[PDB]
Amino acid sequence: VQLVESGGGLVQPGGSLRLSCVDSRSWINVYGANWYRQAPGKERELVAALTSGGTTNYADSVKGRFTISRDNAKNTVYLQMRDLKPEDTAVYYCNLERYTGSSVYPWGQGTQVTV
Amino acid sequence: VQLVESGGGLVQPGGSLRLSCVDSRSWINVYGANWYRQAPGKERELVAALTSGGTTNYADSVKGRFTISRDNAKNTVYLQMRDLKPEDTAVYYCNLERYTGSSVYPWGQGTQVTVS
Amino acid sequence: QVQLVETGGGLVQPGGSLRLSCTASGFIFSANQMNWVRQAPGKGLEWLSGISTRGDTTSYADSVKGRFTISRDNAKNTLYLQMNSLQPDDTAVYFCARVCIRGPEPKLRCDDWGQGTQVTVS
Amino acid sequence: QVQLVETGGGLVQPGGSLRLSCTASGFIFSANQMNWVRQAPGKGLEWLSGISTRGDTTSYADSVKGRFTISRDNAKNTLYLQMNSLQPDDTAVYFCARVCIRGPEPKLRCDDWGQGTQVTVS
Amino acid sequence: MGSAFERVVRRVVQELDHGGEFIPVTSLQSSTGFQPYCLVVRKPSSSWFWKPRYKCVNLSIKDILEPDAAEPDVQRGRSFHFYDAMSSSTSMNVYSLSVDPNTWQTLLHERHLRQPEHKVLQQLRSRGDNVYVVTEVLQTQKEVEVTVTIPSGSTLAFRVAQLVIDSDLDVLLFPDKKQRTFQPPATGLTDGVPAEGAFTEDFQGLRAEVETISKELELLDRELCQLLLEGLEGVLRDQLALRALEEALEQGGPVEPLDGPAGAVLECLVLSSGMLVPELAIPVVYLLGALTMLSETQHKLLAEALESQTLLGPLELVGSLLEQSAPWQERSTMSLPPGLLSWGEGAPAWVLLDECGLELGEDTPHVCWEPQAQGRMCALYASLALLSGLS
Amino acid sequence: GSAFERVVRRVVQELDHGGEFIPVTSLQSSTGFQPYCLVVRKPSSSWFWKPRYKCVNLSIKDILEPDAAEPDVQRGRSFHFYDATSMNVYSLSVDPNTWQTLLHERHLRQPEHKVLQQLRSRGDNVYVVTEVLQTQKEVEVTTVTIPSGSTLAFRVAQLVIDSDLDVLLFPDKKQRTFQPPATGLTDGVPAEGAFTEDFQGLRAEVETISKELELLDRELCQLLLEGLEGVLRDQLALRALEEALEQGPVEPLDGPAGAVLECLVLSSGMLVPELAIPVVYLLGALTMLSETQHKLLAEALESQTLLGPLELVGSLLEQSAPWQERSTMSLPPGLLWGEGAPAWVLLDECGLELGEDTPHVCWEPQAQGRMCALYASLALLSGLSQ
């Protein structure tokens, strides 16, 4: 398997979503994970990064609304979404980056959020 | 240690939703999967059943409105839900049933489904 | 770990048909030549059919050529065998195996094998 | 496969502190006794600390008692070692180990080990 | 299509166990006591090629739990009609009784291990057993196929879950192979109890595998041994000649006509035609595989101990440490017997260990085993032993 | 000596958290390991060490039909390492998404490259380097300079070759690069790519125990066999003897079980571990067998006819190795005899299907434990019978 992105959907401004990045294997729990998004007509955009240790960093456009976390037993890295706006409408992908910075998997189908 | 259920949420009548039942092991592919639902203070009921070969069965309250499917490569069994109506708010759980009829895992936490 | 699970066997009418499935887990299914092999009483193992990784080439033993069709659904990690015009000498346990080599000598070795499912032509 | 991965080792001033983590995969973490063991330069294995499956009880060696603290988060499947007042005699490769039998007579033996994290105090 | 008793068991499992989780019963008597909730034990293995079987200790899990109470409900499964081979005596029906996985959540919450732990449990801990509880049985409804009578309710196959006890009781539906029932205290202090891998022969396989190839090397008359040793003296001091010799000995005709001492080795494996003698090439290819694992400094030392007749001490020294450190994926502290020391930072045997990845100190006979040093150490012993075999 | 090797292990332990990186064997081998390099893994020759990867100074672009430059490598984090004047390690990796575009924009060149047949003939598995850990220029404390860009460790993805080429990032352990056609016929030679040493390994575990028989004075070898003959014809006595050796002094059993144990104790009746250990192994092997097999073993022992079965079991086990595989075995002509023959029943009791009008007997992996236990029992009884 590869990363499986789910949880996306259609909402109206101000709403809230929670997307899932699931790894059948355990690389998600030993390496870093990032959530990207390729917004309609716009290029793929990194949304949140989570280091192997759990250090979080976000982009300016999403601070105060998005929270990235990890559930080891579920091999899941989540994207808690709040105060969603149509500027957040996109298909969301996740990827894994090793401590050396190399990516582990190619992209999954992603999950669409439409606000 | 068990199955993981996701996909629940809040939608307006006539929406669409498809839950996920993901297995960390290959039992979801060799065995059958069933979806249940519990409303608070009432009895757990079966809503849809899927055998390993793909045979589907549904509850009359959802017959023609729910679809139970499997993605073998994703190790995930879905419950596509349709003609969404009240009385479908309940705690929905999935399980795995061996060919002999025994259960594989204890219940997970479930996924929240709310309709109004 | 590699798992190969066969279903679809049973007791069949002579001249009848059966369809066997074989679900594969624990390896990259789409990257492996796959096969069906059977074990008949008093007979050695008999390779019946083979299919390439993508499924663009297939091979059959004379004993089953024209009657049986091998196929694979790579997206679901499943191998199949359609059986038609079954005869009493086709009674055997049928196995799906991963990567089978028959080139060197009349012999048969395959990397991984399934548990088998019984087929009986009454 | 069982995998134990230690992180958190490094260089600290004398009298400084370090916290080691050990993430576990391949087994039911909450069902296994866990340990921290260090390998000092030129020295044999020195067992440091142990913890019960649920964490309700722990045990420490004298060399680190009061200084180090062993803990686990069974919900996150992680083993930790907080190390305080480190001195150069605490410089070593630090290992987490699953199920250790420190038979007073024979020797220390544990079922599974991490790759180790180097702790250097200077 | 069953025929005999086990052959019937074989088919029942082949038909009903899609996931391969079931344990077949081997004899009809053994099926006694194997009911839902019977406690079964698997004693430590003495062979890597067969493990002792699960055996009921004729105890139920409720017998070790506080609040004494009847076993919880069982859940009935599907029934299957086999109709058999070699209400009908020819016919058989087998059904499933299983424990719901959710029963443990409530049961282990309603009830608790007798903290004055059961007398028998204290026996199993001393005997080193892992203890399991039966979670499913496939059983017959009525007596069947009786020149062979099978009483009703005979178990044909069963599933278990592993017990784990650390001042408590938990039931693991899917444990790993290494999981122990009797967890050690926080102190790791135990006593003579079967432990540490259900036995291992890591060292035993290596000595024999070397000896077989050493025995395959007995095919050489001592004359051909000498010229081969003359050829072996050379490539060990020539890294690149060693690589070319190994490549000349791969799969696909007449051997590569290598110049230099690598040629002499090849001439020991061919007829006047230059075609390999496989039974002669086979053992040599093995040794080159061991040597290719070693480093240049190891190669240089192996030559000098060979010429100095000093291959014997190092062979013994390496052998004991491989004996001591097995299993070699585990970490452990070895002890150098001074009765085999022949020592010093520059000592030839000292350097062989450093090249394997071990760090040695002058003030102690203890050496920590590094699992990453397994291959080179084993190849080192293989080289030393085989080179000693040529004498 | 040992210098560059110590640096490699340190870097990996610090940077390889997942255990996915392969250390470079020697500073000699450290160069040439670059992203997109093709390395090969020839078939192994030992249970106890694995062959080296070997960069074959060929690149994956060279075997793809549009001959063009390789895609970019991902320049990764730089790492500044510790000594107390430093060593800096940088990551070059192939993005996993590179292969998807590459293997569609290019396709394996037909006819194949010359090298591939050579690797196919030798049974090599073929991989491509997907990441390297490399240096800038510095010296080793050891004194000896490591050139800039020296690979310390690398990651690989396996190539699989069929009608087309694919790159597998996480292949399984048995995966082969060179797949057979749908025919299953791999034209040209054995070129096996497999090896078991299952039977020879079984012979070794047995021999550990066997050599301990001759230490018995021949009377003890004699009393032991007679006690065994007795317990072989008594299932519950056999089990009681088995359970007596799973434990203070010994349990005072009478009968053939007592005859066996009497061979194994001291004046004090305490444990005699040097004696029990081999016996417990034999009792373990016998316990694997059925009641029918036990009584035949007693008969073969009393009749001193152990060889005929012993040779046949070993033949079949050696033919069926590896025993987790299915195969057609051949009965060596001349028992090297249909239903009712002792060997027939002995092999029938293991789960195998024998035919009187056919030399064919297929191997049943479920019989692996019983057959191996059966092989061991025959041998050990023969030894005490000398």
What is the domain-level CATH number for residue C94?
A: 2.60.40.10
Chain center to CA of F171: 18
**DSSP SS3 for F47:** coil
Number of domains chain A contains: 1
Percentage helix, strand, coil, to 5, in chain C?
Answer: 5, 50, 40
* Distance of alpha carbon D25 from alpha carbon D32, whole angstroms: 12
Do E116 and E133 form a contact (C-beta atoms < 8 A)? no
CATH number at residue A13: 2.60.40.10
Q: For residue F88, which of F76, F102, F70 has the smallest C-alpha distance?
A: F76
Q: State the amino acid at position F100 in one-letter form.
A: Q
Asked if F103 and F65 touch (Cβ cutoff 8 Å), the reply is no
For chain C, positions 2-61, list CB contacts with chain F under 8 A. Answer: 2, 26-28, 31-33, 35, 37, 39, 41-45, 47, 50-54, 56-59
Are B74 and B24 in contact, with CB atoms under 8 Å apart?
no
Cα–Cα dist B55/B69, whole Å: 9
Rg over alpha carbons for chain C, rounded to the nearest Å, is 13
Distance, in Å, from the CA atom of C120 to the CA atom of E1, rounded to the nearest integer, reads 9
- Candidates E52, E178, E39; CA nearest to E117 is E39
Cα torsion F265, F271, F272, F277: sign:
positive
Q: With the CA atoms of B97, B102, B104 and B108 taken in that order, what torsion angle do they form, in degrees rounded to the nearest 10?
A: 80
Q: Quote the CA–CA distance of D84 and D18 in Å, as a whole number.
A: 7
DSSP label of A107? -
- A51 contacts: CB under 8 Å, gap ≥ 6: A32
Check if the beta carbon of residue F380 is closer than 8 Å to that of residue F209.
Answer: yes
What distance in Å separates residue C113's CA from the closest CA in chain B?
16
Chain E: touching chains (3 or more CB pairs < 8 Å): B, C, D, F
Domain that holds residue A63: 3-113
* D68 close to D48: Cβ distance less than 8 angstroms: yes
Of D3, D115, D120, nearest to F13 by CB-CB distance is D115
DSSP state of F278: H
Separation CA F376–CA A53 (nearest Å): 52
- Other C-beta atoms closer than 10 Å to the C-beta of E174 total 16
Q: Report how far Cα A79 is from the mean position of its chain's Cα atoms.
A: 5
Residue D3 to residue A26, Cβ atoms within 8 A:
yes
F297 in helix, strand or coil? helix
Cβ contacts of A83 within 8 Å, gap of 6 or more: A14, A15, A16, A64, A65
Cis before F365 (ω within 30): no
Residues 6+ apart with CB under 8 A from B108: B2, B3, B4, B5, B93, B94
| Euclidean distance between CA atoms B14 and C102, whole angstroms | 58
Helix axes E312-325, E202-216, angle to 10 degrees: 150
Separation in Å, CA A19 to CA A22, A91, F305: 10, 11, 72
Provide the 8-state DSSP code for F213.
Answer: G
The length of chain F, given as a count of residues: 386
Tell me the residues of B at the E interface, defined by beta carbons under 8 Å apart: 1, 25-27, 30-31, 52, 98-107
Query: Residues in chain B, how many?
Result: 116
Comparing C-alpha atoms, which of A26, A34, A72, A65 is closest to residue A51?
A34
CA E70/CA E67 separation, integer angstroms: 10
Distances from the Cα of F229 to the Cα of C23, F293, F298, F308, F340, angstroms: 48, 12, 5, 18, 21
d(CA E318, CA E90): 64
| Side-chain half-sphere CA neighbours of F174 within 13 A | 18
Report chain F residues whose CB lies below 8 A from the CB of E46.
280-281, 284
Closest CA to D67 of D39, D36, D41: D36
CA–CA separation, F210 vs B108, rounded Å? 53
Instruction: Give me the number of domains chain C comprises.
Output: 1
Please state whether beta strands C10-12 and C117-121 pair in parallel, antiparallel, or not at all (unpaired): parallel
The angle that helices E296-307 and E374-390 make with each other, rounded to 10 degrees, is: 20
Experimental method: X-ray
**CB-CB under 8 Å, E375 with F2:** no
Helix (H), strand (E) at residue E318: helix E312-325
- The 8 Å CB, 24+ separation contacts for E4-8 are E4/E86, E4/E148, E5/E148, E5/E150, E6/F290, E6/F351, E7/E86, E7/F351, E8/E82, E8/E84, E8/E92, E8/E145, E8/E156
Counting one residue from chain B and one from chain C, the pairs whose CB atoms sit within 8 A come to 21
Say which residue the tokens 């048969």 belong to. C108
Say if residues F107 and F64 touch (Cβ distance below 8 Å).
Answer: yes
Give which of B100, B103, B107 to mutate to test E binding, by max E Cβ within 10 Å: B100
Q: Do E166 and D103 touch (CB under 8 A)?
A: no
- Bridging pattern class, strands B90-97 and B32-38: antiparallel
Distances (CA, A) of F67 to F33, F59, F62, F158: 21, 11, 6, 21
| Per-position b or e across F32-48, b if 16+ CB within 10 A of its CB | ebbbbbbbbbbbebbeb
Residue given tokens 């991490």 in the structure block: D114
Question: What is the DSSP secondary structure assignment for residue E154, as one 8-state letter?
Answer: -
Interface mutation vs chain B, best among A74, A109, A112, most B CBs within 10 Å:
A74
In chain F, what residues touch E250 (CB-CB under 8 Å)? 42, 122
Instruction: Judge whether A62 and A84 are in contact, CB under 8 Å.
Output: no
- Amino acid identity for residue F166 in this structure: D
Cα–Cα dist E341/E85, whole Å: 69
DSSP state of E90: S
Joined together, the tokens standing for residue A88 give 């957040």
How close does chain B come to C76, measured CA to CA in Å? 5
Q: How many residues does chain C have?
A: 122
Take residue B29 and report the two structure tokens written for it.
């592919």
Which residues are within 8 A (CB) of F34 and not within 5 positions of it... i.e. 6 or more apart?
Answer: F55, F92, F129, F132, F151
Q: Which residues of F touch D116 (CB under 8 A)?
A: 13
Q: Which residues pair with F40 in a beta bridge?
A: F54, F126
* Numbers of helices and strands, H then E, in chain B: 1, 9
**Cβ contact F13–D118 (<8 Å):** yes
In angstroms, the CA C28 to CA C33 distance is: 11
